Amino acid sequence: VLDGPYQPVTFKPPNDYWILINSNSNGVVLEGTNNTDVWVAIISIEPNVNSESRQYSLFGVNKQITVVNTSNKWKFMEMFRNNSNAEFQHKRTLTSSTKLVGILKHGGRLWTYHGETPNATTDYSTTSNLNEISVTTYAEFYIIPRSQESKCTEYINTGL
Numbered sequence: 001v002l003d004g005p006y007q008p009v010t011f012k013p014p015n016d017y018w019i020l021i022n023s024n025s026n027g028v029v030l031e032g033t034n035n036t037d038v039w040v041a042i043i044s045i046e047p048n049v050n051s052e053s054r055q056y057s058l059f060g061v062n063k064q065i066t067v068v069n070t071s072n073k074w075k076f077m078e079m080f081r082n083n084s085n086a087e088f089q090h091k092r093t094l095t096s097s098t099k100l101v102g103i104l105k106h107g108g109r110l111w112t113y114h115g116e117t118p119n120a121t122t123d124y125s126t127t128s129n130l131n132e133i134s135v136t137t138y139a140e141f142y143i144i145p146r147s148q149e150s151k152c153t154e155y156i157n158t159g160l
């Protein structure tokens with residue numbers, strides 16, 4: 001039985017649970033910060049978009065990012081910085097036919113998926129303040145224990 005769907009909210013995800021977000025839409029999918037050394041946002045770009053400048057609100061502030069996606073898959077850009085005075089930079093990308101995006105707090109690190117479905121894999125950003133990372137989701141989501149991560153990886157890559 002799936003733990004969800006839950007509607008968009010700001011919360012503090014517990015350690016060792018995947019938050020799996022089911023985006024139908026373009027724009028910001030999630031954003032998270034501990035206000036110290038992690039700011040992350042995942043931004044969705046629909047299929048077959050030629051190069052263009054778009055505006056996104058990250059933590060209440062408007063940013064202009066130039067995007068492109070000539071694929072028939074959706075593209076999710078992971079934007080990141082580790083300091084409040086820095087600018088957001090593109091760190092990684094997930095290219096997806098399923099439109100599911102994941103985040104996980106585990107083992108002193110923050111985990112997301114990247115690469116291209118059906119072979120998306122996990123990678124991490126480091127932090128010395130993991131517990132304090134909160135997230136705001138902009139679409140409905142499910143919660144899946146890390147003990148069942150192979151299921152979450154299956155969903156990411158082949159659909160709910």
Ligand SMILES: CC(=O)N[C@H]1[C@H](O[C@H]2[C@@H](O)[C@@H](CO)O[C@@H](O[C@H]3[C@H](O)[C@@H](O)[C@@H](O)O[C@@H]3CO)[C@@H]2O)O[C@H](CO)[C@@H](O)[C@@H]1O[C@@H]1O[C@H](CO)[C@H](O)[C@H](O)[C@H]1O[C@@H]1O[C@@H](C)[C@@H](O)[C@@H](O)[C@@H]1O
Pocket residue numbers: 104106107108109111120121122123146149150153
């Ligand atoms: C190898 C592994 O288990 N991969 C896991 C990944 O594990 C990390 C994680 O636990 C971090 C925590 O900070 O520690 C890493 O290990 C450290 C170790 O403590 C020290 O030796 C240190 O000095 O260095 C190493 C490495 O830096 C662990 O390796 O955790 C992530 C987040 O949950 C998992 O996504 C990842 O799991 C693998 O993911 C692959 C896709 O990228 C692929 O799907 C693999 O099948 C998958 O592994 C399988 O599932 C895991 C959840 C776990 O059950 C593993 O045993 C299993 O093979």
